Amino acid sequence: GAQVSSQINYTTINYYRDSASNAASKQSDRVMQLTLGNSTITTQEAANSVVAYGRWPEYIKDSEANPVDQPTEPDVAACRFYTLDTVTWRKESRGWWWKLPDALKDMGLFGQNMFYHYLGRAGYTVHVQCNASKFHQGALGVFAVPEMCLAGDSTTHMFTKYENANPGEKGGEFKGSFTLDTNATNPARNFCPVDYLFGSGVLAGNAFVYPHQIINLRTNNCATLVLPYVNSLSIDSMTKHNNWGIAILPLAPLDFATESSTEIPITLTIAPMCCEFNGLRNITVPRTQ
Amino acid sequence: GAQVSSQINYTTINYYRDSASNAASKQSDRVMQLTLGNSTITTQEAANSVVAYGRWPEYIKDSEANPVDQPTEPDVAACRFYTLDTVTWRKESRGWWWKLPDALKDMGLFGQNMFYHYLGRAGYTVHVQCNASKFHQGALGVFAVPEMCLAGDSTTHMFTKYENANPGEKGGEFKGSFTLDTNATNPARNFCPVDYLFGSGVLAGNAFVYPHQIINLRTNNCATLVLPYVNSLSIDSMTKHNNWGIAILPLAPLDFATESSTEIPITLTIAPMCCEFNGLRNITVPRTQ
Amino acid sequence: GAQVSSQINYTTINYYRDSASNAASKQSDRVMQL
Amino acid sequence: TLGNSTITTQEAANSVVAYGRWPEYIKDSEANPVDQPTEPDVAACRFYTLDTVTWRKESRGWWWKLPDALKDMGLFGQNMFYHYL
Amino acid sequence: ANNLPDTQSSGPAHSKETPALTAVETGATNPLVPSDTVQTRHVIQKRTRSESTVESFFARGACVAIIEVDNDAPTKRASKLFSVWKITYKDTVQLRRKLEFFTYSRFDMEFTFVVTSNYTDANNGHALNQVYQIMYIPPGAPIPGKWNDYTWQTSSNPSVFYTYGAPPARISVPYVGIANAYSHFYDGFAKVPLAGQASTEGDSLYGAASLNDFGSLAVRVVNDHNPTKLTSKIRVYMKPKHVRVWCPRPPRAVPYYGPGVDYKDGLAPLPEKGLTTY
Amino acid sequence: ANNLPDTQSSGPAHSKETPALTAVETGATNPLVPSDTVQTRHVIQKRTRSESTVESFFARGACVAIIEVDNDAPTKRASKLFSVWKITYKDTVQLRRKLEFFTYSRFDMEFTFVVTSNYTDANNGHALNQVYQIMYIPPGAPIPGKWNDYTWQTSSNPSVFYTYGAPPARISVPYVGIANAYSHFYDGFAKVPLAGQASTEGDSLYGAASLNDFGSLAVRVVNDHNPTKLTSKIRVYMKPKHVRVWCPRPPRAVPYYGPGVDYKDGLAPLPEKGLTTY
Amino acid sequence: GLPVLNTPGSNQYLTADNYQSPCAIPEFDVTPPIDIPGEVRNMMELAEIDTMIPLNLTNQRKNTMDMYRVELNDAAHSDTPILCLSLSPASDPRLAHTMLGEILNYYTHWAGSLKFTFLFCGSMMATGKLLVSYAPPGAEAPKSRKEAMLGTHVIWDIGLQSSCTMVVPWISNTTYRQTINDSFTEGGYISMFYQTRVVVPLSTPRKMDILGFVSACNDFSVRLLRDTTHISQEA
Amino acid sequence: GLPVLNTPGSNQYLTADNYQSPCAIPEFDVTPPIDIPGEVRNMMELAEIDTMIPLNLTNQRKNTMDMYRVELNDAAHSDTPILCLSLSPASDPRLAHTMLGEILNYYTHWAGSLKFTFLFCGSMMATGKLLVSYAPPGAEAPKSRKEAMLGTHVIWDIGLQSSCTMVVPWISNTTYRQTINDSFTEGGYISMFYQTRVVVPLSTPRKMDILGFVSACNDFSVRLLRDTTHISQEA
Amino acid sequence: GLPVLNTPGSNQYLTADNYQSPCAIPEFDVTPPIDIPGEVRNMMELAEIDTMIPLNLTNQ
């Protein structure tokens, strides 16, 4: 009935059936080995691993299962480390980005299961590898961004086409400045993610609110982010929706005591985890080019 | 006094004497024999029987008896199977309809009791009989429609005359299209029940919400509907008011491997049940023609 | 004080001193000598 | 019923379990390879319908091989070709 | 408003039970669940049908009438100083269709009156706030013949006096039917014509029970007229409450044509769509 | 809204524990307190974070729309006798930015409607008090085509009739998302284009989920027109209630440009400041 | 009197409000109810009743009884679909005007498994096997049996039991789908194919009809009442 | 009815009010929540996360990634400051647009200790000692290490642990400071100096970068919610 | 004061309403009733009394 609450008290009574009608109630860490399926990663210069939001990937609990068909759980056939194409960190590099599960769409049986099913769910283990010498310097910020929406390149809002929004393993690169696409006849309809705006109109310095690690070449040569499935749904369409983005930004430029421009590679190795698929039918073949 | 109810609760108090003032509170089956009176029906190709709304016909309980005079219950003299005139199902047939008790008004002592009394009540056992060969095909939907109001044939609303609304055992037929009666001098004042509109402006496909059976010639040759008395009153005037309508629609057309147009008969056999009559006086003689 | 009455009940309270202020409460025989 | 596929029949002649042995997974007492196996379950253990053939008066018969006949059947085929065993 | 059954895990099936096959000829609907035909996981179902109860389905005020009245000099024969609206839900369509999903119904009824007014010209001064009288005239009570005749004394009729600018007026009535339920459909007549009666006798409209089943509302502006004409509309909103309904029916598919089930136009509701077109 | 830890007295330190030194490479924030690096006294802390709870942060009505309607003769084609506003918090910026501090949210929502009106000219008489209808049109319900078409019967849509001069109208809705939370950001498409489909097929806006996710509000003046034109604005104020939020994000730093994350102008927010200038 | 403070929303009229109001006819002697057969307590009860699907909405069949009949024949086997429709029970024209679709068109959101039943109305001497398939969305719509058999499906043997039911299980990313045509909450594709073929002996009709019915399963629910587009009025 | 008396404030609309209102969608079947990772319950949780400081807002560096980098080199020792800023976390341009500053700009008052972390991004072969100082206000701002070392300070040794944290303790006359530039609640001065110098061997970059981060300590709180100046809209 | 919200029907006058109103003559010394014969408590009591039927309504 009547609720008496401390403020000397005050009385609150709900006069309506629906709760929405209620008033607001104001009351060493360097050495690691990771094994998934038939794949293993060793590192001697890690900086510990970051479990995003302190939540390990997990399968859908019965209390949260939306679809009713028996799901597929390929386990080791898909929950394994796939190594993406290596990119080159140079002095002039502004950064790189990938989307998940997009980046893994062509990765063996994970990709097959992804495209054969209406619904897919997976966490990830992202392992960024970047080794240099004790005489190199530079720092990479590695950020795992839930719902990493990126800004387009045109005056038309939300106009980036599916093909450019889902580049696959190659990913994309941040730019140093915003260039407006003025070709009205054949618009690029591509992202224009500016680095200091973190590609979405927010200062890059604040991107550390996201789960992240820093590869500081004097300290570590790898970063490991363990990402749970993050979404507003227990399970979603992997082809329509990228749950995670990976952003790599050079926080401190690459440098090495030589006149010639040094370049070192960055390699991404990503393992889906707790993969779960529902809604089997004929294979989805997305439009490309 | 004050009602505390879960939504974290809410309090409801009725401030008015009358309940209307209160706020809304949101809280084998193929073989059968039927015997009634001196009449018996056998069937070897039934599809079970449908008791409309799962309610067997019953006499008026004392707790629901409106008229105070001692009722008449002829029992076997009236609660017996009467066989209506047989109709012919052809390829072109659009369907047939009857009204109850209207269809039985000339059926022996049931009709006599019906016309000698102001008030009458009865459930029914409707038995549709339609046999063909294993080389015939076709399907009849048999629907028992409470308050089966049918659309008229004129611009004047509700203009169908009593004589045409109560055709008797011959019943009427659904039409394939709506034809407006334009004869203003001598209007037909007849129904124009279109088949796909179920004769009342509702899609025939939805008529299955009503108690129904299907005579699928490959499966069964009869349908049995047991209809309780359905009305907004315990008892009503049988001459003024038809409690039930029977509609028979060819869901799948009659077909048979011959160039000549095949025709098979449909026979309705209807037994009043739990007949109860009140208000005896001189016999009602309805106007005809 | 508060009167709870059946209509599923309803509550009636009189707010005035005077009763008039109250709402309406809906609750042989042929032969004789004299 | 297997996976998302169902077969009904009204004119069967019972079913024959070959040699009276129902299919089963490899027991630990008989497992030769040591790597953790993949068991796609419903993604692969489901009814696939092959191309229909025509029985005529002159037909002499037909043959298929398993697993060969199913090699292009969705995720069963994918798993078949992605694995040594 | 009950919760829904959980989905149970179901594995492969190989048996003589065939839930997929049935016989719709019996008139029954095959009560299959997904686990009867496919492999299913365990799902703890949390959805409920709270908003599809009949009460929730009808728990909305629907506009059933727009009664227009005037405040003007009685010598102006064009103006209408009072209006009588026979009570019914069949002057509009939406609530009618919702109700006619069913054959019978019992409900209390909440009437809410939304009154709007406006000037008709600008060269005859202004007006003081109007008061409107809405008198229920049950069948048999005298109908007002003039905006100021004796009937407006309303000694026994219930009347609501509504002051313009106040929140919409509102009253409630219980189930007032003379039968045990309201009949949305009546397959019959008020009269049975008798043999020998002239053609002008025993004739009644098909499907009508009473010529006046629920009476009328008579609406007037109580104020004497200002030098300028004012027009007002009283919109009547019905809300069924404590609803019970019997014998569901297929909903109206073609436009209503009168208070009966008759149809004249729009007899082609379905659009064109290929048989093999998704 | 919890209280804060007291500061503990801390004296001189001479040891091998070095809380000052850390490694931000790990991705963690060094959880140091003043006593870790300086000598501190004992302080009984009395400050609390009651006003920075997410509920307190969002416990404000914010204007999300200004819906303009007219009361005028329907022959005046310039006047707009009804207006449809698609429901969203992205027509203004302030509430949008506050919400977009986070990636997901669940909340009930309180809508408050502040209605103002005025004359447009002075040579056509005066007006009686107006009543406004605000009808919620959930996705799929028919949108009004005219200010007085059948849709305004609102038999099933919720409508609020607001009398001018009354305190702002107010209603509440629960969390109505079809997902388990509202998504402030959606990195995906409504459609996946399929190989072989023409360029005009399978194309959808980046980041849009539904073409119509929460429906619209249709607003009209119920009154018939006075001889003079009246203009009204209905300001819609949203207040999230019972807020829960997930996955914090850096706040918008450059001006919003459309409903997406796109940016075009004002890409130089930071001002100039010397490195060694206090 | 008692100090009070009027809050926002005072004097408004919300058509969905649930308040008490004075009775205009006090002390009325209400007629008691009787036990009428067929009482309904939830609109979903109506959606759970099978109603015939106007599957064949061609130019010459729509708005006639023929729209309810899908013609099969005994031609040689083919993989081409017999019928195709989208799982949009409220907006697909073949489902919108069924009882299920009519009920859905009063609500904004729906969720749960659907139930499609097919009745074979050929002669008893006709035999055949059909395949009824549901492909959850996101891939190309099945245009031959080869693609359709990869999704959910039931192989229907036409025999003594002349009806077959395929349950379309609830498979959705969102916990509810919208009752409009919208790609984000698209439902998938329902198709029918010849498994073997229809075979008849001599002296038997070589063309017959099948009828389609749809209803809601017991896990089905709707929410967000709304006005339908299926009824309109004119001045 | 019950005698009532309307008080002042009746019929007003206070945008901060907390009243009940009627539900426009009664009996709605709300979708239950799921356990989404990363739930936030207090905005201070966000302020406690280290975010990079745009320390170098020169003409050529502002509004670029370069603004986040402060350049050190191996020149001879000097007492001149490396970087200087004011403890105005909401109004100092180098702090205003950090996550801490962004949160503060929604509030009028702030109190508590701040936490500045510096990350050395030179080569492993580079060594050096720096001094990071906080001078509570009221005296001349430290313009050389001699003055700065008299205030609160930490001497940072660049070694295997490449990051150093200096806690700016809460030292204020008032129990809260305003989130604007105001001398009465000024916060003091933060500066960095070379303690010894940066030393590198041959074949090593002689110029490197340090990155700055700021966050709030667990004793930090804010009050008096307000609209920020960091977002604006135009007609 | 106490937060209140005025509902529809406020300020109307329903002639069938049953509300309390202030007494215009407080503390009036009402004359007590006496036991008058022939008290009636229901109008049906009057309908149950036989009354003569004007059966013959001819012109004269």
Ligand SMILES: O=C(O)c1ccc(NS(=O)(=O)c2ccc(N3C(=O)c4ccccc4C3=O)cc2)cc1
């Ligand atoms: O504004 C809307 O709410 C409203 C607007 C349009 C609407 N539908 S309508 O088809 O335009 C329509 C328009 C008027 C009437 N109508 C009358 O003309 C009338 C006269 C007298 C009594 C009753 C009524 C009555 O219902 C009925 C329907 C309903 C309500």
Ligand SMILES: O=C(O)c1ccc(NS(=O)(=O)c2ccc(N3C(=O)c4ccccc4C3=O)cc2)cc1
């Ligand atoms: O007075 C203030 O409170 C108010 C004043 C200015 C303001 N910001 S604005 O940038 O001037 C602005 C001005 C108008 C609109 N706006 C429209 O023009 C409109 C049309 C139709 C629907 C919704 C809207 C809507 O938001 C949006 C923003 C917001 C509110």
Ligand SMILES: CCCCCCCCCCCCC/C=C/[C@H](O)[C@H](N)CO
């Ligand atoms: C101001 C007081 C007015 C009170 C008016 C009371 C009348 C109540 C009418 C309720 C309407 C019931 C709906 C109609 C039912 C069916 O159509 C009839 N049984 C057949 O005409």
Ligand SMILES: CCCCCCCCCCCCC/C=C/[C@H](O)[C@H](N)CO
């Ligand atoms: C008069 C009654 C009107 C009732 C209106 C109910 C609609 C409620 C809308 C709440 C707004 C939620 C905020 C939007 C969430 C995200 O943007 C969407 N998930 C993505 O579009």
